[PDB]
Design a binder for this molecule. Structure first.
Ligand SMILES: *[C@H]1O[C@H](CO)[C@H](O)[C@H](O)[C@H]1NC(C)=O
Ligand SMILES: [Ca+2]
Ligand SMILES: [Ca+2]
Length: 229
């Protein structure tokens, strides 16, 4: 179906739903909470989602957002993701599950219905993932189907980074491009039939989790979808 929105900043959150530890703060979406002293709270997850459902049958979309990772040590955890899931998808487990999975089914593709582009700051030993910080495409599992190295210089840059995520509904391909000002660029794509996974309605949004020593912020976001028919 056709949907468009545009948030150059979050002075308005009219159409954004916050769940778990996420909240609007300083004209941003703050995905995980901080205490009254500004310190990241450990072991929390949060979602900030566009409230209106849409359909993926015969649909292409383009979305872009800007983001900042604020770290308070060289060992931040856990990261954040942009995700698509059914409209009643709740905030799930904190830590390396990124708010998107739970321990007993996190690697079981038959037990999940969620697609995401993750920005992963903490190398988990509890399931397979690369030995370095990474950006990945996840299809129904916390073990990414496509994953690439995310350079530490960019992770810790303090920059406002940009992501572009697109889905071509004819070729059935999800793509992310991530760019840093005067830093790295990242390209990842995967063939996945989203309408097969999600025959009904979905929402798109962000999930963040701690972890420790990290807060994730979304500074702007826009989206457009169009019919392929
Ligand atoms: C365990 O804690 C670290 C931080 O010390 C990370 O948050 C990691 O993801 C956690 N493990 C799991 C399985 O969530
Ligand atoms: Ca990962
Ligand atoms: Ca991880």
């Amino acid at each position: 179906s056709e949907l468009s929105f545009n948030y150059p900043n979050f002075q308005s959150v009219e159409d954004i739903t916050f769940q778990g530890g996420a909240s609007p703060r300083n004209e941003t979406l703050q995905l995980t909470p901080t205490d009254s002293n500004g310190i990241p709270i450990r072991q929390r997850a949060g979602h900030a989602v566009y409230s209106q459902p849409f359909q993926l049958r015969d649909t292409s979309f383009y979305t872009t957002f800007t983001f900042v990772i604020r770290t308070t040590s060289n060992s931040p955890a856990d990261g954040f993701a942009i995700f698509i899931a059914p409209p009643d998808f709740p905030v799930k487990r904190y830590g390396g599950y990124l708010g998107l999975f739970e321990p007993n089914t996190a690697t079981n593709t038959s037990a999940n219905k969620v697609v995401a582009v993750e920005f992963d700051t903490w190398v988990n030993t509890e399931w397979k993932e690369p030995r370095y910080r990474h950006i990945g495409i996840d299809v129904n599992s916390i073990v990414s189907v496509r994953v690439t190295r995310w350079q530490d210089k960019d992770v810790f840059s303090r920059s406002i980074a940009t992501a572009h995520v697109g889905y071509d509904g004819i070729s059935k391909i999800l793509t992310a491009f991530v760019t840093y000002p005067d830093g790295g660029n990242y390209v990842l794509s995967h063939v996945v039939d989203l309408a097969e996974i999600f025959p009904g309605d979905v929402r798109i949004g962000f999930s963040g989790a701690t972890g420790q020593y990290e807060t994730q912020y979304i500074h702007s976001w826009s989206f457009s979808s169009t019919s392929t028919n």
